[PDB]
Amino acid sequence: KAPSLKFTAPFGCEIYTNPIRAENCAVGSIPLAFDIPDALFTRVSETPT
Amino acid sequence: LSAAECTLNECVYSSDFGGIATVKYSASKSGKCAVHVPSGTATLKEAAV
């Protein structure tokens, strides 16, 4: 029994059991898309300047 | 008036009255009178302030 994947995983993952899953593997990057409606854009003079 | 200065707070060339100009003046008498733009550059909302 060469040690578990809990202790040997690259990027510092955190292997768990009941769903087989890894946690918090610091690798890659998430891109994001924001479809923002036009109602949220407050005008200039309703904010300090 | 005497020594009046005009700055543009909001400026958006929208179809409605989408621009705010705050005229910083210094008046000899305190009384209402009429503002106007001679050109077709801007169309003012109110006739007097």
Curated annotation (Swiss-Prot), chain A:
It is a single-pass type I membrane protein. N-glycosylated. It is found in: Virion membrane; Host cell membrane. Disulfide bonds join C13-C25. It comes from the Viruses. Class II viral fusion protein. Fusion activity is inactive as long as E1 is bound to E2 in mature virion. After virus attachment to cell receptor LDLRAD3 and endocytosis, acidification of the endosome induce dissociation of E1/E2 heterodimer and concomitant trimerization of the E1 subunits. This E1 trimer is fusion active, and promotes release of viral nucleocapsid in cytoplasm after endosome and viral membrane fusion. Efficient fusion requires the presence of cholesterol and sphingolipid in the target membrane. Interacts with spike glycoprotein E2. The precursor of protein E3/E2 and E1 form a heterodimer shortly after synthesis. Processing of the precursor of protein E3/E2 into E2 and E3 results in a heterodimer of the spike glycoproteins E2 and E1. Spike at virion surface are constituted of three E2-E1 heterodimers. After target cell attachment and endocytosis, E1 change conformation to form homotrimers. Interacts with 6K protein. Interacts (via fusion peptide loop) with host LDLRAD3 (via domain LDL-receptor class A 1); this interaction mediates viral entry to the host cell. This is Spike glycoprotein E1. The lineage of its organism: Viruses, Riboviria, Orthornavirae, Kitrinoviricota, Alsuviricetes.
